Structure formats: structure tokens, C-alpha cells
Design a protein around this ligand. Sequence first.
Ligand SMILES: *[C@@H]1O[C@H](CO)[C@@H](O[C@@H]2O[C@H](CO)[C@@H](O[C@@H]3O[C@H](CO[C@H]4O[C@H](CO)[C@@H](O)[C@H](O[C@H]5O[C@H](CO)[C@@H](O)[C@H](O)[C@@H]5O[C@H]5O[C@H](CO)[C@@H](O)[C@H](O)[C@@H]5O)[C@@H]4O)[C@@H](O)[C@H](O)[C@@H]3O)[C@H](O)[C@H]2NC(C)=O)[C@H](O)[C@H]1NC(C)=O
Ligand SMILES: *[C@@H]1O[C@H](CO)[C@@H](O[C@@H]2O[C@H](CO)[C@@H](O)[C@H](O)[C@H]2NC(C)=O)[C@H](O)[C@H]1NC(C)=O
Ligand SMILES: *[C@@H]1O[C@H](CO)[C@@H](O[C@@H]2O[C@H](CO)[C@@H](O)[C@H](O)[C@H]2NC(C)=O)[C@H](O)[C@H]1NC(C)=O
Ligand SMILES: CCCCCCCCCCCCCCCC(=O)OC[C@@H](O)COP(=O)(O)O
Ligand SMILES: [Ca+2]
Ligand SMILES: [K+]
Ligand code: NA
Ligand SMILES: [Zn+2]
Ligand SMILES: [Zn+2]
Length: 781
Amino acid sequence: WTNTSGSCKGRCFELQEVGPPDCRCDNLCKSYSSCCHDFDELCLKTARGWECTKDRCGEVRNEENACHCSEDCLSRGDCCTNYQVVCKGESHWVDDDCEEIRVPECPAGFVRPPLIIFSVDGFRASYMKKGSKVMPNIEKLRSCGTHAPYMRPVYPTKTFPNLYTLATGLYPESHGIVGNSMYDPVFDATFHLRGREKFNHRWWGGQPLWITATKQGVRAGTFFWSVSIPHERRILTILQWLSLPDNERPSVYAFYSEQPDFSGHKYGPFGPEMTNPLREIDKTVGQLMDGLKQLKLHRCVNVIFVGDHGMEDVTCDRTEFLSNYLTNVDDITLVPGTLGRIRPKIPNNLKYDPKAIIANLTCKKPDQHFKPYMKQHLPKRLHYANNRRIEDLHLLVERRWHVARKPLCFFQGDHGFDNKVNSMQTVFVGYGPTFKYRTKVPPFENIELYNVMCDLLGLKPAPNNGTHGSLNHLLRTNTFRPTLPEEVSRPNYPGIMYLQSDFDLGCTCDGSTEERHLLYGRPAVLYRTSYDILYHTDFESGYSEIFLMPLWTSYTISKQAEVSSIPEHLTNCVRPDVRVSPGFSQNCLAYKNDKQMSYGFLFPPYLSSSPEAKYDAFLVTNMVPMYPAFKRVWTYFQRVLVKKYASERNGVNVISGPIFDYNYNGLRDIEDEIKQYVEGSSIPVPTHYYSIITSCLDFTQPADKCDGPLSVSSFILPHRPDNDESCNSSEDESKWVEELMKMHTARVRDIEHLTGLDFYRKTSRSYSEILTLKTYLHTYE
Ligand SMILES: *[C@@H]1O[C@H](CO)[C@@H](O[C@@H]2O[C@H](CO)[C@@H](O[C@@H]3O[C@H](CO[C@H]4O[C@H](CO)[C@@H](O)[C@H](O[C@H]5O[C@H](CO)[C@@H](O)[C@H](O)[C@@H]5O[C@H]5O[C@H](CO)[C@@H](O)[C@H](O)[C@@H]5O)[C@@H]4O)[C@@H](O)[C@H](O)[C@@H]3O)[C@H](O)[C@H]2NC(C)=O)[C@H](O)[C@H]1NC(C)=O
Ligand SMILES: *[C@@H]1O[C@H](CO)[C@@H](O[C@@H]2O[C@H](CO)[C@@H](O)[C@H](O)[C@H]2NC(C)=O)[C@H](O)[C@H]1NC(C)=O
Ligand SMILES: *[C@@H]1O[C@H](CO)[C@@H](O[C@@H]2O[C@H](CO)[C@@H](O)[C@H](O)[C@H]2NC(C)=O)[C@H](O)[C@H]1NC(C)=O
Ligand SMILES: CCCCCCCCCCCCCCCC(=O)OC[C@@H](O)COP(=O)(O)O
Ligand SMILES: [Ca+2]
Ligand SMILES: [K+]
Ligand code: NA
Ligand SMILES: [Zn+2]
Ligand SMILES: [Zn+2]
């Protein structure tokens, strides 16, 4: 019980923690039915609005007014934000010339620059193009500070998963807020963006910035605002907190606006009606900046202006209905809209038939505007599977569309789609002493910001999914010095120690390498295992004696490299490898015998330097288990695409290899976790194959003679026994394989998690630059 009879006198928006039976006067109070009886009256004044007028200057203080224009308002810290402009002849901040802030200029008592995070909901990256005509304050922040052309949100591209990702540095599958709505089958309870269940702490994992701050003795303002508190009051409150005594003043502040998301939903992102909400947000940014200038803080504070996701054109007329595909949709519950998650309506309903449902949802209309996936099959870049709150059955919905359960308008915009979709990208601007001046940076992912905010506050971040150092280039100072991970396992370098006669595998056949095929140094193995370096004319590899295949195969292909064929008499040519024991080798009998599984090669014979070399490609230590379905993809990649890349990029360095992730947690499987082997054998079957293709950013220089920055694209291709994912796969590979690959684009960092390898250890670039390179995602948008 809360004694609501107390008073919020002298307590409005107090920062001190106050639990029952004492009544409260903060933001969460309304949400908890714990506000004191005079909270609304004392703390939410509205009288006379939010702006000083000339006729109010030097007024006598009336405590009933929303903000003040009396002579004492300054030292009391509660002037209207425009007080000085109107009453003292000052200029609005936006009207002042931009000037580099080379070190913080903070008042006496400020030990470090405060951080203010200004979050805007549904702020599409492209809205910034409206510029100073619509958003003069924001445009000044953008042009004079550090800006990205866009920031990538996490999937699903909705509010709760993204705000909490911003706060934690974690993927939703890790922090637990995997949707605006979700069902937890262990709680047997349902979370919604609106309602009280979300206030229960059991939903919220990781360690959000305010807790990290607090546990390290840095004070935080609120990271929650009751919907009923107007934006102007939120701004005045932050400014009041900044005026507090040195021993009370917080170091980090958050402001949140539910616009322009609301108007985006109503009118769509390209609507003329979007101008007004964008103007209003800009006015709010102006209030804050004018307010900060009034406090002599405008060259002291670091401001982050950041969105949660973008906004797409989505109307009633573009809705797919499951009832068109499935006979009894009343027996399933669908999380619907710009994504789909399906579970039985009755939890644990034994008649639920997911394989039948998936079959009925697969490539059933030529223009089908969604695609079903079991969650383990979703692109690995989405990192959306390792959580009990994520339904096994997912629908990835095409941009501009909705999926609904059944037919049983007032919106023109929505969001939630695949986070690489252009319309879903959002905004990032950093302004203040710690950010760079007039600097543009490449787009980056929102998971990276928590580390940077910790940097801006002198905090040590909790374990998260950012790559710390990858955003050092946004910062003038306070950068984080990364350190190379230490190699755990050193390679064996086996020479010849066997003769062909030593091998009974069932197979039949009728320097200057390390320097030239490992342009960036050998990957470091970061786990305990046993493996061999193997040199060849055309390629090098780290062959695992445990997994009976290479962890990685590395080779360079010149722009003018020639593509040869595989002679008919060598079709089935597999050769034992006299450097590796028979006992540490695969055997062809297992393949001959497995009716479903074939094999492929990591270094493609098609790219051999010479027939004497080409014969090396057929070694048993270059072979990996591949389903025929996958071979269709891999052969096209090996034969057509690698050369095509080399031609377009002026040669390419390639590293390819297997990935094992049977429990879909995005991390290298240990031996015990591998669940599939080639029939009759102990040859483990990869769940995915990766390839990392590197070249010179300056395409005028060949991959192997690159003086400066690198260019990289990578993929993590699912190793599946069919091509059901690709609706056009009955056609020639040239009509569908690249499309599949684009969907499964990946960051090098993703591959590192999944393999326990560390790449790019020997280059001429800074470690920070390499970290940026490793987080890059080639999106194909
Ligand atoms: C993204 O970055 C994160 C953060 O580093 C990585 O996630 C970590 O992975 C490691 C290694 O697999 C896990 O280690 C295990 O930890 C558990 C003990 O975990 C408990 O205690 C820790 C510490 O307080 C706590 O953070 C954990 O929180 C998990 O469980 C909570 C309670 O249900 C839940 O509220 C929270 O959301 C989180 O759930 C997530 O992780 C669990 C696995 O623990 C997973 O099943 C769930 O579906 C979510 O994904 C928990 O209370 C030990 O028993 C093990 O031996 C081992 O030490 C970490 O727990 C985990 N940390 C977090 C916060 O998720 C990701 O791997 C990384 N992803 C990629 C791709 O790189
Ligand atoms: C709930 O709050 C009210 C107001 O604070 C409490 O009222 C006070 O009670 C004490 C103890 O009897 C009196 O001495 C004061 O005169 C009261 N103050 C006022 C202004 O009414 C009340 O006690 C609280 N209820 C509880 C503790 O259960
Ligand atoms: C998958 O779709 C087929 C229709 O293509 C459904 O088949 C119907 O099944 C009902 C009873 O299950 C039969 O009475 C109808 O004759 C079938 N329709 C047609 C057009 O052949 C099937 O039910 C669907 N499966 C699921 C799980 O929804
Ligand atoms: C440190 C990391 C960044 C912290 C930033 C500030 C967080 C402020 C939280 C303010 C209160 C946040 C929750 C607001 C919920 C809300 O107002 O949703 C409006 C809905 O229409 C969104 O639905 P949708 O657009 O469909 O996802
Ligand atoms: Ca795993
Ligand atoms: K076979
Ligand atoms: Na198909
Ligand atoms: Zn949102
Ligand atoms: Zn929205």
C-alpha cells in the first residue's frame, strides 16, 4: 500500500528512490498509482504556457506558472527556455554561428561533460534531408557535430526492442525484449507495450546504461517519461536537474519523443502532413539548446540525437491473410503486421502442426509478400533466435506489406521489417566537446552505441554485442584502446609423413604462399583445439584434426585470373593428403554411402593456377560435406561469382570455411553440441558456410598491392537439404543464387563469433580501423 496522503511539496521530480508506503513525485509514479495527492497540482503546472512574452519580463514570480520570466528565474533554474532571448536580448542558439568545441567549456563544479540522449521515435534517416527549412536546430547539430548518414536498428524494427538495445548494447535475443508484445512460455505470461505487465523486472535482461552508471557511482536522470507529461515539461525538468547542487546533479539524461512515429503511422513517411511534427520536434530541440545556453552549458554537454527505427509506406490494401493459405487460422495466435510470429492459440496445443503450416506457407503465390522461416533458418545477421520468447515459426514480411491472420484506411505507415531495409534506417548525430566537429562517419549499428555512451561517461561497459573501439572514429577524445585477443591454439606445420599406401579412404582419382594468400595474416584460433597449416600453390588453410576439415581456407584471385573447368575424368577425384594422418581424414566411402549428402571444395578447382596445382584442390583436406541443394549455390559461387568479384574489385582475397551452430546462439559450437554427421561416419556437418571477400578500398590498386583502407563483403550461407527458401530455384542458378546470398550477407564480426577465429591481425591499418571494418555489413540496398 502507498500512502498517497503525503505531499510532493519541494519534491517534484525528485531523483531519490522512494518506496511504499511513502508516496512518490517522479515519472514512474503515475504508472504505479503511487503519486502523492498533489503531484499533478504541484509538479505538472501548465499556467501561461511554455514561453516568455515581452509583457512578462521581470514579472513578479507566480508559483502557479509553468515556467518563469521573473528576474530570479535563472539562479532558481526554472526560466522558460526563451527567457533571455525575449527578456535580455540574447540570441536563440540556432541563430548562432557554429564554432568548434575543442574542450568542454563547463561552469565551476562540472567535473565531466554531462551526456543528454535525445531519442525520437520513428525518425527515418531520410527525414534529415528536409534540412534547415524544416529542422533548423537539428540541422545545426547535424552539420556542426558528427553525423552518420543513417544508423541501423535491430530486428524487429519496432520501439521496445530498439530502445532497450540502445540502452544495453545487446541483441533482443539476449536482452529479452524481443518484441513490443511477446509471450513467455515459462512465465506463461504476456508482455505488451501498453499495460502493466511490462513494469515487472523479470522481462528485462542485460544491464541498461542507467544501472551501469549507478553501479559505478555515476548519477542518472530518468530514462522513462509518463506519456501524460508534455515534452516542454520534460525539457524544463532536465534543465532543472542540470541546475542542481554539485552533489545532486546527474551526469546522464534522456529525453524521449513519441513523434514523428505517431504521424508517420497516420500519414505515411512521405506525407505532406509530416512537416508539422518534424517542426515540433525541432522546436523542442531548440528549447533544450536555448535552455542549455541560458545555463552556460551549450559548449559543455554532449548531446546524442538518435532514433529507434524508420518508417515505411504500409496501407490496408497491402495485407496478406494467413486464412488464404491455412484451413484453420482460429487455432493459431499470430503476432502480426510487418513481421509474423506464430504459436498455437492454446499454449502447448498438441495438435499444432508446424511442418504442415510451413509447407502451406512456402512459395504458394507467385507474388507472395512474406516468407516463412523456422527461426534457426533466419539470416544470421538478424541474431533473432536464441530466446524462448521467439516463436519457432517466423514470417519475414516484404517491405510495404502487412501479414494478418484473417480479413475479419486509418494508417499509411508502419515499421518492423528486416533491419537492412532502407526505410527502416534511423538517425544518429553526436554534438559536443567529445564528438568530432563537422565530421561524417559511415553508417553503423545501434548495438555499438552503449559502449560509446559508457566511454562518454567514463564507465566500464557490461558485456554486450558491440565491438568496443569500432566507433572510436566518432570521438575527439575518450576513445577506447582495444587490445588484440590472444591466440589460444598454435598450428602444427606437418610435412610428409605418410604414403598413398597408408590410406584406405575409399577415394579414387584417375612462401610465396603465406605472404600471398594470407594478405592480412593468419586468423588466430581463440579456443583450444588441434590444427595444421597446409600450404598449396593456390591456397592455404588451417586444417582441423578434430573437425576433419579446414576451419578456414584462404586464397587470392587476381583480376586477370583465368577460370578453367573440372576435366571429366577428375569429376569424382579425391586424393588423400600425405601430410595428414589417415585417422585425421574424411573418407569418400561415407559419401559414396550417404544417399543424401555430397561434398564440395573450399578452394575451387575452377580457379587453379595450373593442372599440377588443380590436383591439389582435390585433396581430401580441401573437401567438406555439402547437400546437393547447397552445392547448387556453392558451385555457382565458386565458378561464377568469385571470379566476377575479382574482376569488379581488381582481384579479391577470399577466406571460406564451415560454421557449426546447432543451438542457434550465434556462437561457435563445441564438439558436444554438433548434432549431425555424414552417414556412418564422424565427419561433422556444418550448419552454414562462410566466405569473407576482401579487396582494396581504392579499386585502382590490386587486392595484393593495397596501400590503404580495405573493402570487405561477407556471407553466412545456410547449409540446407533443399532450396525451399528460394522460390525461383527451379530456374537456372543465375536467376536466384545471388538473391539468396544478398539475404545472408554478414559482418566479419558475425563470422568471428560463429568460428572462434580472429581475422585481420596483420595489416597496415589501426586496430580501431580494423574493428570498424569487421563490423561493416554490405546491405545491397
Ligand atoms: C551478445 O552479448 C551477450 C552478453 O555478453 C552474450 O550473451 C551471453 O552469452 C554468454 C555465453 O553463452 C552467457 O554465459 C552464460 O551465463 C550463464 C549465467 O547467465 C545468467 O547470469 C548472467 C549474469 O548476470 C545474466 O546476464 C544472464 O542473463 C540471461 O538470462 C537471464 C535470466 O533468464 C535473462 O533475463 C537475460 O536476458 C539473459 O538471457 C539470455 O542469455 C541466456 C543464456 O544465459 C539465454 O538462454 C537467453 O535466451 C538469452 O539469450 C543469466 O541471468 C551461465 O550459467 C553459463 O554457464 C554461461 O556463463 C551469458 O549469460 C549471456 N549474457 C547475456 C546477458 O545474454 C551473447 O552471446 C552475445 N551474442 C553474440 C552473437 O555474440
Ligand atoms: C499517511 O500520510 C498522512 C500524511 O502524511 C499521515 O498523517 C499524519 O499522521 C501522523 C501520525 O498520526 C500525525 O502526527 C500527523 O498529524 C499526520 N499528518 C497529516 C498532515 O495529516 C498518516 O499517518 C499516514 N498514514 C499512515 C502512517 O498509515
Ligand atoms: C494446406 O492447404 C490445402 C489446400 O491447398 C488444405 O487442403 C484442404 O484440406 C481440407 C481439410 O484439411 C480439405 O477438405 C480440402 O479439400 C483441402 N482443400 C483443397 C483446395 O484441396 C490444407 O488443409 C492446408 N493445410 C493446413 C495445415 O492449413
Ligand atoms: C540509453 C539508451 C537510450 C534511452 C533513450 C530514451 C528512452 C526513453 C523511454 C521513454 C518511454 C519509452 C517507451 C515509449 C513507448 C511509446 O511511446 O510507444 C509509442 C508506440 O507508438 C510505439 O509503438 P511502435 O511504434 O509500433 O513500435
Ligand atoms: Ca552454438
Ligand atoms: K552421396
Ligand atoms: Na524452391
Ligand atoms: Zn518506435
Ligand atoms: Zn511506430
